Each structure stands twice: as structure tokens, then as C-alpha cells.
Subunit: 194 residues, 2 copies
């Protein structure tokens, strides 16, 4: 009799598990909304990351050795280096920062949440002063090397300042995931014990 | 088994009755204070 009572108490833990399945429905709805946002946002970043790998050594190496950089390349390269903690406006610092063979690695490492809001607003104002620039002269033929990296640079700013809309979303998601995963381990483990 | 389980749900109600016995202890303490006050006050009114 006592054993069956304990089994029912675990079936009561299972009822709590049905409540956790309602929590799972909430989690699925929130994750569906977040993944819809991610499908809207992240896929071009993935394409840019792939294109950065597609970038050939010759295209960048020939143009680094150029005596004078074209104005579009300067405009689109200064802001990219503003990401790389080497904030500067001189061509020789660009050349030195790009010379190292260790610069083929972090074309993908840079992450969207590391940017500061003031830098985001600065680059928004730079976009305003240079709206006809960027992807348009990428399409023209400014250079084959710039294209992937310029499109990478124009991104990561859309993610910024509306990932902060997703920050409370992902924090609530993390809370729900932790509670629900602990409760589902209880569900599997309580099911085993019952 | 279900009959026994209903009996033990009523035993959970008996645990609630033990909680109500704690409430009875509270009630007895408060009534003892009130009856002490009444013994102090009311008896001369009864005599009158």
C-alpha cells in the first residue's frame, strides 16, 4: 500500500510534469519567435562568414601593397578596423594591422555582442554620410577582396541594438530552459523511479 | 488501492487537522487571556 502511495506521489510529480509541458509550450512559442528573428537576421552573417573563407590570398595581398587606397576602400576599411580594437584613421596602421598572417583567423571570430552602443551610433552616422557607398560599389567592381569583408562589416550592426531586444527574450529563455530541463530530468528520472 | 489512497488523502486532511490543533493552541491561549480579563472585570458586574 505504501509503495503504491509512493508511486502516486511520483505520478503527482508527473502531474507537475504536465505543468512543465505547458511550460514547454510556452518555451516552444518563445523559441519559435526567437528563431524567426534569427532566420531574419543571422543567415546573411553566415553567408558573409562563408565568403570570408572564400576570399583568396592574392586579392587582399595585392591591394595591401597598393600605394594609394581608393576612397571607397578607405571608407569601408576604417570602420572594420574600428571593430578590431585598433581604432585609427591612417592607411599605414591599416597596412600593419592587415599584414600579420594571424589576420586570416579573426575574419569570422568577431561577434555581434562585443560592440559598444556609442560605436554603433558612430557607424550609423558613418553610414548616413556614406549611404551610396558599401555594397553598391561592391556590386560595381571596387575590388574583389572588399566585397565579402565589406558586406561582413555592413552587417553585425543590424544584430546590434535589436539583439538587446532579444537579450530579455534570451534571458527569459535561459530561465525557462534551466527550470524545464531540470524538471524534465526529474520527469525522466522520476518516471524511472515510479 | 484507490480506497486506501482516498483514506490517506483524508489523512492529509488529518495533517491539516493537526494544523488546526496548533490553531486550537493559539485559540486556547487567546481565550485564556480573554477569560483572565473577564475574571478581572465581569464578576463584580454579576454581583451587582
Amino acid at each position: 500500500v505504501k509503495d503504491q502511495q509512493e508511486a502516486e506521489k511520483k505520478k503527482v510529480m508527473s502531474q507537475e510534469i504536465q505543468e512543465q509541458l505547458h511550460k514547454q509550450q510556452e518555451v516552444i512559442a518563445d523559441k519559435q519567435m526567437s528563431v524567426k528573428e534569427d532566420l531574419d537576421k543571422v543567415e546573411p552573417a553566415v553567408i558573409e562568414a562563408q565568403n570570408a573563407v572564400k576570399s583568396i590570398k592574392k586579392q587582399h595581398l595585392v591591394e595591401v601593397r597598393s600605394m594609394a587606397n581608393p576612397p571607397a576602400a578607405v571608407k569601408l576599411a576604417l570602420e572594420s578596423i574600428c571593430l578590431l580594437l585598433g581604432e585609427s584613421t591612417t592607411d599605414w596602421k591599416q597596412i600593419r594591422s592587415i599584414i600579420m598572417r594571424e589576420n586570416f583567423i579573426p575574419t569570422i571570430v568577431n561577434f555581434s555582442a562585443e560592440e559598444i552602443s556609442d560605436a554603433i551610433r558612430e557607424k550609423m552616422k558613418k553610414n548616413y554620410m556614406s549611404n551610396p557607398s558599401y555594397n553598391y560599389e561592391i556590386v560595381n567592381r571596387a575590388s574583389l577582396a572588399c566585397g565579402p569583408m565589406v558586406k561582413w562589416a555592413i552587417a553585425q550592426l543590424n544584430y546590434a541594438d535589436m539583439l538587446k531586444r532579444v537579450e530579455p527574450l534570451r534571458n527569459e529563455l535561459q530561465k525557462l530552459e534551466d527550470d524545464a530541463k531540470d524538471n524534465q530530468q526529474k520527469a525522466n528520472e522520476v518516471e524511472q523511479m515510479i
